[PDB]
Amino acid sequence: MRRYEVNIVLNPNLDQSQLALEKEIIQRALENYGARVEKVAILGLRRLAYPIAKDPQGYFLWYQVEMPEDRVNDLARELRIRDNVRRVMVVKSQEPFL
């Protein structure tokens, strides 16, 4: 098992309601791939390094999880496919939240 930080960028045009749902769905997907979600945070709107879908902004969601390394890729694939998901980045935790 490995601990990861899942960084998700969502459509900046979604409202409080839509963001909450995507956040819940994404969390359900993580667990579906054997993950145990330790922490979640809504980081908010940020100016992307490069526009995605013609929009220079994105809404950031963050998750800290522990899951089988062998399921991360498939998980990353599924999430990138979501309509409201603009960017997915799963990295190995360095200084995990307690």
UniProtKB/Swiss-Prot annotation:
One of its GO terms (molecular function) is structural constituent of ribosome. Pfam families: Ribosomal_S6. GO terms for biological process: translation. It comes from the Bacteria. Signal peptide: none annotated. SUPFAM superfamilies: Ribosomal protein S6 (SSF54995). The keyword Translocase does not apply. Keywords: Ribonucleoprotein, Ribosomal protein, RNA-binding, rRNA-binding. GO terms for cellular component: cytoplasm; ribonucleoprotein complex; ribosome. PROSITE patterns: RIBOSOMAL_S6. Part of the 30S ribosomal subunit. Forms a tight heterodimer with protein bS18. Located on the outer edge of the platform on the body of the 30S subunit. PANTHER family: MITOCHONDRIAL 28S RIBOSOMAL PROTEIN S6 (PTHR21011), SMALL RIBOSOMAL SUBUNIT PROTEIN BS6M (PTHR21011:SF1). Belongs to the bacterial ribosomal protein bS6 family. This is Small ribosomal subunit protein bS6. It comes from Thermus thermophilus. The gene is rpsF.
